[PDB]
UniProtKB/Swiss-Prot annotation:
Role summary: Responsible for the majority of cleavages as it cleaves the C-terminus of replicase polyprotein at 11 sites. Recognizes substrates containing the core sequence [ILMVF]-Q-|-[SGACN]. Inhibited by the substrate-analog Cbz-Val-Asn-Ser-Thr-Leu-Gln-CMK. Also contains an ADP-ribose-1''-phosphate (ADRP)-binding function.
Active site: H41 (for 3cl-pro activity), C144 (for 3cl-pro activity)
UniProt-reported outcome of changing E109H: No loss of 3CL-PRO activity
Effect of T134D: Complete loss of 3CL-PRO activity
Full-sequence range covered: 2966 to 3265 of 6758
Gene behind the chain: rep
Taxonomic classification: Viruses, Riboviria, Orthornavirae, Pisuviricota, Pisoniviricetes
Domain Peptidase C30 span(s) in chain numbering: 1-300
Protein's UniProt name: 3C-like proteinase
Consequence when changing H171T: 93% loss of 3CL-PRO activity
Effect noted on mutating H171S: 77% loss of 3CL-PRO activity
Amino acid sequence: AGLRKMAQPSGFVEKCVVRVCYGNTVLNGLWLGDIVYCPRHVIASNTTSAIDYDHEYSIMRLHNFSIISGTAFLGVVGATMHGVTLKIKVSQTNMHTPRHSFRTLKSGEGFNILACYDGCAQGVFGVNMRTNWTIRGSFINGACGSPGYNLKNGEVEFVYMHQIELGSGSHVGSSFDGVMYGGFEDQPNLQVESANQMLTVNVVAFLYAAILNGCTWWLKGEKLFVEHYNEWAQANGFTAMNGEDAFSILAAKTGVCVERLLHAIQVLNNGFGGKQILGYSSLNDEFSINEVVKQMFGVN
C-alpha cells in the first residue's frame, strides 16, 4: 500500500486509566494490579515555586486522594514515592490488567501515547523518543500521567508517563520506575533541552520504504562511506550511522546499499525542490526499521 503514521490499538490500555485527584490538582493515573501509578506532582500544594518533595511527601494526607476508574471509587490504603512518580496502593485489583512489563526507552525507539484528560482516553498517536529525550506531542492542561505504551509478544509494554511541557513546546515523561527521560525535573523553572538531531537510522528506513514503493527519482548510484557520512552528520544535525548491519532491506530491493541512502541523505537534506517521497516534502525521521517492516511486510 504505502507508509502512514500510525498507532497500535489502545483498548488494552484504556481500561487501566484512572482520574487521580489530590486536593485541588487533577491528573491521570495508571492502575495495574492493586497499584495506581501517577506523577508525584499531584500532591504538590503550589506548582509555582521550587517544590520540596521530601517535605511534600511528609505532609501528604491520603484522605485528600480520590481515585476514580470509570464510575467507581478506589480506596487508597498506601502510597510511596519513587523518583518522579507515586505508587499509590489501593484495595481494589484491576481485573482488566493486561499481561505487561515496564521498559525504559532508548534514543529513537518508537512508541504510542494515549492522551488522557479526566481519567479518559481522548486520543492516540505514535511518537518517537527523541535524541534530546523529549517528544513532539500534543497535550494541554491535564494530560499529565497519560501513558505511553507498546504491544509486543502479546503483552503491553509500559514506557512513558507524561510529566511536563518545556518552554519550547517539547514534552517529557518518565518511565514507570520514576526516572525522567533526559534527567529533567518536575519543577516549574525554565529547562532547556539539548538540540534535536535527526535520526539517520529512520531516514534510511524511510528511503528504503520509498524504494519498496515506487519512489526512486532521488536515488543516484554514487556511494558515501559511513565514516564520511558521520563526519558530515556530526556537523549538519544528524545522528551518527552506527548500525549499518540492521538492514536485510539492503538485500530485499538489493541494488541499494546503505551507503547510497547515506548519500541521498546529504543531497536531499537541502531540499526536495517541490518533488515528494511517499507524500512528504523533506527527509522524515518518524519511522524506525521495525515500523517500516511492519507496514511493508506485515511483519510484527
